[PDB]
Structure 1
Amino acid sequence: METIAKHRHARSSAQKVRLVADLIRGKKVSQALDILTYTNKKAAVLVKKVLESAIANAEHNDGADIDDLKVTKIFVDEGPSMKRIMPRAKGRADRILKRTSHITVVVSDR
């Protein structure tokens, strides 16, 4: 059975997360936690928490024991971006677009 997990409004741009997301696509869950652990990005921590959350979902709510599971989709989509203001020079102003992302991890032991 496929179990999904989401982290919406994650404080990281989708472009940065996709680099980590393409790293773990199609790999075993046990391997996936190892790579994410020894990956020096904060965005790696966010995806690792969602992956770990998905494992707990597959294990408790839905059925599935352990090992056999493996990640099949890890698409990360954009999220609503707050628009702050940063004063520049000579009066000019800029629209700092602090962006966010939606991390989704779908794992199926198939």
Structure 2
Amino acid sequence: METIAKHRHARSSAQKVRLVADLIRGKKVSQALDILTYTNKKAAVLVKKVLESAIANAEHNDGADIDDLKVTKIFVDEGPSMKRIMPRAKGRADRILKRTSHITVVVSDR
């Protein structure tokens, strides 16, 4: 039995979130939470919330045991971008992109 959790349209760049996603791929959940608590990055808070949501789903909807779960899959995909204008010298205008991501976590008892 696998259980999913997601955070869609997150305010961050996928390249930045993948640095943290790579730390907890294939670990036990208690070890993964301990790792995420002592990482000084902004993406760590977001990933931690998603992991906690997945664990709670597995406890409530599927009747799982906390001590048996492992992070079986995790990945980050790119979302829509917002477009903005920034003025520069001599009356020239530049474009700014504000990037977002989707975050997916899958836990399993196997």
Q: Report the TM range for the smaller structure's normalisation.
A: over 0.9
Bigger mean CA offset, 86-95 vs 48-57: 86-95
Q: CA deviation at 1:76?
A: 0.6
* Shift, 1:66, TM fit: 1.0
Task: Using the TM superposition, give the Cα deviation of residue 10 of structure 1 relative to its aligned residue in structure 2, in angstroms.
Answer: 0.4
The CA distance in 1 between the partners of 2:70 and 2:90, in whole Å, is 55
Question: When the two structures are aligned, how many residues end up with a matched partner?
Answer: 110
Q: Which whole-Å CA distance do the structure 2 matches of 1:96 and 1:49 have between them?
A: 29
Aligned to 2:19: 19
Matches within 5 A, 1:1-110: 1-110=1-110
Unaligned segments of structure 1, at least 5 residues: none
- Consecutive unaligned residues in structure 2, runs of 5 or more: none
Superposed CA offset, 1:61-98 (max 9, x none)? 12201111010111110111111111122222221110
TM-score (normalizing by structure 1): 0.96
Greater Cα shift, 1-10 or 59-68: 59-68
Q: Distance in 1 between matches of 2:52 and 2:99?
A: 24
Partner of 1:96: helix, strand, or coil? strand
Question: Which secondary structure state, in structure 2, belongs to the residue aligned with residue 45 of structure 1?
Answer: helix
Runs of 4+ in structure 1 deviating by more than 3 angstroms, as ranges, are none
TM-score normalised by the chain length of structure 2: 0.96
Secondary structure of the structure 1 residue equivalent to 2:101: strand
